[PDB]
């Protein structure tokens, strides 16, 4: 199977994701709705059922609408049975139609359907040729109340009917009882409960086993990726472990939300996207495009330099789903807004780097605040807009213009208003022109590509009034006016000579698990494959062919690897970087080091014995270490994704930048647990 197979669960940037809010999207089967105050068919109160199902979805997979626009993938709201209280939110009925308020993991949301309409969902949609993606929030139930029991369903876990625990008398602690989050600092937004939504505590054994059990359950069902829920409010080492159980079973396509704010850049999202085993939302880049497409509040200098410092921020910028709005922020266009700003940031989206995502109703022009006026239900299945039209034309390009899906960004023209970018892989590809500036023309002279020289027709044929373009030799393009509003897209696709990796994922897991690296040029015959100096031929390459390798990790020591391969002759490719080699499964196991005292600024971290520890390089230390929530300075605390069942040696360091102060004495040793967690407790040694 190629890399753009809907069979690749692992690959996502050849496809264009299209997010569904289930109940706002297509009822269709009535017995299902839920009934009287929770229920609202005329859909008037977007904070009451509406009825939208996986029938509704199954229903317009097969008449067309979303294969007609292109879309190759689609995220659902969490499937996962939720509570059925309707919170009076003062003076407001609120109903868990959005999915995130859980209660059982294990049993699907009665109001979406059952296991047999889920499971005829994705056969539908695999049959169609679409992926289907759905949201995860392990990070929380309900809403609950400690003293008020009677609040809700008391954020009630329930283990597939069997009742785990609630949020009152917490005996188990199988929730944080530390009060809510401010935001204030990133230990607090986790160990905290993120509004009044009962917090799960991944620390506990039922809660980590219990989490881990139940995604097996959905992988089994035939998920091809998740969307896990508030990343930045779950420890971290946690995440890796969930996402350790996942590739070292079963593999899929993942990325997480860490919200991120205008003209914010973080580098503690940066080091997630880049060693926890999930991608993220790009929403640096969102923020951006909404910032210079909608808000006018940046120019297409402040797109260029989120291009490239994304692109070098991120060790797999390929992996970051990208979208111009979504069910929490104000739908991108307004009702006054021209039209032509929705349809060029769309464009935009689809034909850049990453995996770009289209929030349902967009297509149709919808518009709306905040929660929960953008979670409406999509009042037209048209396929006569502009911008249905648009992603119809562009979607596509993701699958069969590799350029578009693993290239390379580079500008080659740009001004306060015009961007002109260009996307490459092999022997392919895709320049993209946009004109923000709504009344005035731009004359491109100067212009210089990697196109052949000919003549190309704007692939989105004259749509947004783009243009042809002339490519003489030197790939210089003839002089041209860039019509006000302008969006055209030109590209070529060739065959690729060499072996090209364009990606590779799973990018975390213990050896002997299956790797999928895609490109251009592999070749049919099988050749070799390398993680860093180690060769790997033959047997262990289950499948070779020319855009997809399928091949499991050798028995390495526990590290970071650079993936190369080369084909049947010898010719090698290129090293496609940051792949993580586990120390086999893993657990999440806490480390509290005692009376470690610091002077402001610096922090305590961890070290020790297997790569998970960063084998005692401090560069690759874990933390710095939390004394706020949990435990206290002078005692630091962390939940850390370690080796199941290993003897380790550890001890703590103290760094204020690249400086470090080891731990004194001996180190300490400690073994994992096989399942499960643990709580390692020492004191620092001086
Ligand atoms: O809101 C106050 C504080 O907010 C911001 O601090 C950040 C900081 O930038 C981050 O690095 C991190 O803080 C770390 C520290 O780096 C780390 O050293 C440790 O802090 C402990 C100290 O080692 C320990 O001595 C003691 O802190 C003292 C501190 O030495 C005193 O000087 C005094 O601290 C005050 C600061 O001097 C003052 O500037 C201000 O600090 C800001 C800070 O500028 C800003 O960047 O307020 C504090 C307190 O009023 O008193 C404290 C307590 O006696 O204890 C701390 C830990 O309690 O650990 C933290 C991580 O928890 O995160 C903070 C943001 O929370
Ligand atoms: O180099 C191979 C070495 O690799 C691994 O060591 C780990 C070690 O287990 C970690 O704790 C950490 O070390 C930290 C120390 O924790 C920290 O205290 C400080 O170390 C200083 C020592 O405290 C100090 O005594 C002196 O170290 C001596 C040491 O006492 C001598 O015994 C000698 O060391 C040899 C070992 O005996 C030998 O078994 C082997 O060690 C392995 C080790 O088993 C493995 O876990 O080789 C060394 C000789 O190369 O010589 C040193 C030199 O005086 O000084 C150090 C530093 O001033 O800092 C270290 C970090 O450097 O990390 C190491 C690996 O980095
Ligand atoms: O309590 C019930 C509410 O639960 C549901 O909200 C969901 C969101 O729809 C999810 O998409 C998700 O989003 C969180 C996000 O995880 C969190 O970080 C936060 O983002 C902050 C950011 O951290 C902060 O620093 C600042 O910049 O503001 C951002 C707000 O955008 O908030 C997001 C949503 O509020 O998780 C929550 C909870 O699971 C449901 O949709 C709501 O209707 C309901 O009230
Ligand atoms: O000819 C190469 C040149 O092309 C682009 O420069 C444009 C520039 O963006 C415009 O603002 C204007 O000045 O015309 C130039 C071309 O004539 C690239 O930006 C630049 O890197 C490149 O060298
Ligand atoms: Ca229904
Ligand atoms: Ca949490």
Redesign the pocket.
């Known amino acids: 199977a190629p890399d753009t197979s809907v069979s690749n669960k692992q690959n996502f940037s050849t496809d264009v994701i299209y997010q569904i809010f289930t109940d706002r999207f297509s009822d269709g089967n009535p017995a299902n709705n839920p009934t009287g105050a929770a229920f609202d068919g005329t859909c008037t109160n977007l904070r009451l059922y509406c009825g939208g199902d996986w029938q509704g979805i199954i229903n317009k997979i097969n008449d067309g609408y979303l294969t007609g626009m292109g879309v190759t993938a689609i995220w659902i709201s969490q499937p996962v049975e939720n509570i059925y209280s309707i919170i009076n939110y003062s003076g407001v009925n609120n109903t868990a139609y959005?999915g995130?308020?859980a209660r059982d993991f294990k049993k699907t949301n009665p109001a979406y359907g059952t296991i047999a309409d889920f499971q005829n969902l994705i056969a539908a949609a695999h049959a169609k040729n679409i992926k289907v993606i759905i949201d995860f929030?392990p990070?929380?139930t309900s809403?609950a109340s400690s003293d008020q029991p009677s609040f809700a369903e008391n954020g009630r876990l329930y283990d597939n009917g069997t009742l785990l625990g609630g949020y009152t008398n917490d005996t188990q602690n199988l929730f944080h009882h530390n009060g809510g989050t401010d935001?204030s600092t990133t230990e607090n937004?986790i160990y905290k409960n993120?509004?009044?939504?009962a917090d799960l505590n991944h620390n506990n054994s039922t809660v980590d086993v219990y989490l881990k059990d139940a995604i097996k359950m959905w992988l089994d069902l035939g998920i091809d990726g998740i969307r896990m829920?508030?990343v930045?409010?779950m420890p971290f080492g946690w995440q890796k472990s969930f996402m350790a159980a996942v590739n070292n079973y079963k593999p899929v396509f993942t990325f997480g939300?860490w919200?991120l704010?205008v003209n914010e850049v973080s580098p503690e999202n940066h080091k997630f996207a880049n060693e926890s085993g999930m991608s993220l939302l790009d929403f640096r880049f969102a923020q951006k495009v909404r910032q210079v497409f909608r808000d006018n509040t940046d120019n297409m200098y402040g797109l260029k330099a989120m291009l490239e410092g994304s692109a070098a921020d991120y060790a797999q910028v390929d992996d970051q789903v990208t979208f111009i709005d979504n069910?929490?922020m104000e739908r991108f266009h307004a009702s006054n807004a021209n039209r032509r700003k929705l349809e060029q940031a769309l464009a935009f989206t689809l034909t850049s780097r990453g995996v770009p995502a289209i929030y349902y109703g967009t297509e149709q022009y919808m518009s709306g605040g905040t929660?929960?006026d953008n979670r409406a239900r999509i009042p037209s299945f048209s396929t006569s807009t502009t911008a249905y039209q648009v992603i119809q034309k562009l979607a596509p390009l993701r699958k069969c213009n590799p350029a578009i899906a693993y290239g390379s960004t580079q500008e080659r023209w740009i001004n306060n208003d015009v961007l002109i970018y260009e996307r490459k892989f092999g022997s392919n590809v895709a320049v993209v022109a946009v004109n923000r500036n709504l009344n005035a023309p731009a004359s491109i002279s100067g212009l210089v590509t990697s196109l052949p020289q000919g003549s190309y027709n704007d692939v989105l044929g004259g749509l947004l009034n783009g243009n042809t373009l002339s490519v003489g030799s030197g790939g210089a393009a003839s002089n041209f006016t860039l019509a006000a509003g302008g969006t055209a897209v030109w590209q070529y696709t060739a065959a690729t000579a060499t072996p090209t990796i364009g990606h590779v994922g799973p990018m975390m897991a213990k050896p002997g698990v299956t790797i999928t690296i895609d490109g251009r040029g592999f070749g049919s015959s099988k050749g070799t494959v390398y993680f860093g100096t180690t060769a790997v031929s033959g047997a262990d390459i289950t499948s070779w062919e020319d855009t997809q390798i399928k091949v499991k990790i050798p028995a390495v020591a526990g590290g970071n690897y650079n993936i190369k391969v080369a084909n049947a002759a010898g010719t090698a490719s290129n090293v496609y970087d940051n792949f993580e080699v586990l120390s086999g499964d893993q657990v999440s196991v806490r480390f509290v080091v005692n009376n470690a005292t610091t002077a402001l600024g610096q922090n305590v971290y961890l070290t020790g014995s297997v790569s998970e520890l960063g084998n005692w390089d401090p560069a690759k230390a874990i933390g710095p270490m939390y004394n706020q929530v949990v435990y206290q300075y002078p005692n630091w605390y962390y939940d850390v994704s370690v080796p199941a069942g290993k003897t380790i040696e550890f001890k703590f360091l103290k760094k204020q930048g690249s400086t470090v102060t080891w731990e004194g004495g001996s180190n300490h040793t400690f073994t994992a647990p096989s399942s499960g967690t643990a709580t390692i407790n020492v004191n620092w040694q001086p």
Request: net charge negative.
């Open positions: 959005h995130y308020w929030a990070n929380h809403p935001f937004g993120l509004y009044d939504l829920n508030a930045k409010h939300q919200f704010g069910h929490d929660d929960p």
